[PDB]
Amino acid sequence: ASLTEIEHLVQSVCKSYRETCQLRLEDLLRQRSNIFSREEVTGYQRKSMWEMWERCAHHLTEAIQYVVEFAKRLSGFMELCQNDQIVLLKAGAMEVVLVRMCRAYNADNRTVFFEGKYGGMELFRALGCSELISSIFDFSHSLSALHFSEDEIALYTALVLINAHRPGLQEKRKVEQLQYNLELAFHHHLCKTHRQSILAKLPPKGKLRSLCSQHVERLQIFQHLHPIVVQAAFPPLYKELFS
Ligand SMILES: O=C(O)c1ccc(-c2nn(C(=O)c3c(Cl)cccc3C(F)(F)F)c3ccccc23)cc1
Ligand SMILES: [Mg+2]
């Protein structure tokens, strides 16, 4: 792919990203001052496990749905057979959700933006997932240290999804090519901005995968104990994770 194609791919990917973000980043930064009372905290901490899970589960569900809309706008994704779109999304939608979190994370006070204000991990205590939730906070913190631009997150998460080494693909070669193109675009943009050095500092893909595995497993257990009701946007994908 030539320079102009690459530039068009970067612009396209970053526009798709911005347009499939729940909240714009300026909002998240405006509100880092708006922090939860200890009264508001204990309020959340005195919530029942189920009502808290319902909140978080619906929040996370909505997030996955924005990520699916992002994928559907990646050049070439819609041209993929339904099987492969499910393979890519089953594996990666939640990996992207986990990456997108670093936006709502404030490494200064170690808090995250949740339901209108910032709170520490203490806020989710009623779920009793301290291990998992501590891990997630560690990951966001780790991503914070890289000071991603919005453009970098867009290209990085595009590559999290468009990965040709996911088990199950049938058009593996078509994915390899969309991936190659996204890698040229990511690398170009990083060079352009003197940020090429972050490539070696990105999370090892294994760490992202395994963390996503822990997280989804836990969520599936909770979905078993206490099903929330989902109006699904990609039914063949929903059926692949909720059954
Ligand atoms: O609306 C949809 O079409 C749709 C909506 C959501 C998903 C989706 N949920 N999910 C979960 O982890 C999940 C969530 Cl976010 C909330 C409650 C329970 C669950 C669980 F049971 F599946 F585990 C995923 C993981 C990986 C990939 C896609 C998804 C998929 C499809
Ligand atoms: Mg240069």
Author numbering: 265 to 507
Task: Provide the publication's sentences verbatim.
To elucidate the molecular basis of RORγt modulation by MRL-871, we performed co-crystallization studies with an equimolar complex of RORγt-LBD and MRL-871. Co-crystals grew in two different space groups. Crystals in space group R32:H had unit cell dimensions of a=b=173.8, c=67.2 Å, diffracted to 2.3 Å resolution and contain one molecule per asymmetric unit. The overall structures from both sets were identical in all the features and the ligand conformation. MRL-871 binds instead to a previously unidentified allosteric pocket in the RORγt LBD, located distal to the classical binding site (orange). Crystal structure analysis shows that this allosteric pocket, absent in the classical NR-folding motif, is formed by helices 4, 5, 11 and the reoriented flexible H12. The ortho-substituted trifluoromethyl and chloro moieties are spatially clearly positioned and impart a specific rotation to the phenyl group of MRL-871 and address hydrophobic sites in the allosteric pocket. Hydrogen-bonding interactions exist between the molecule's carboxylic acid group and the side chain of RORγt residue Q329 as well as the main-chain amide hydrogen atoms of residues A497 and F498. The arrangement of the RORγt LBD in the presence of MRL-871 generates a druggable molecular-binding site critically regulated by favourable interactions of MRL-871 with the AF-2 domain. These interactions reposition the highly flexible H12 in a conformation unique among reported NR ligand structures, of either the agonist or antagonist type, and distinct from the previously reported RORγt agonist-bound state. The unique conformation induced by the binding of MRL-871 prevents interaction with cofactor peptides, which typically bind RORγt through a conserved LXXLL motif, at the AF-2.
In particular, RORγt, whose activity is required for the proliferation and functionality of immune Th17 cells, is the subject of intense investigation to modulate its activity to achieve clinical benefit. NRs are characterized by the ability to bind small ligands at a highly conserved hydrophobic orthosteric-binding pocket located within the protein's ligand-binding domain (LBD). Helix 12 (H12, also called activation function-2, AF-2) can adopt distinct conformations in response to ligand binding, regulating the interaction of the LBD with cofactor proteins with resulting changes in gene transcription at a particular locus. Here we characterize the mode of action of these inhibitors to guide an optimization program and surprisingly find a novel binding mode, thereby identifying the first allosteric-binding pocket for a highly potent, cellular active small NR ligand.
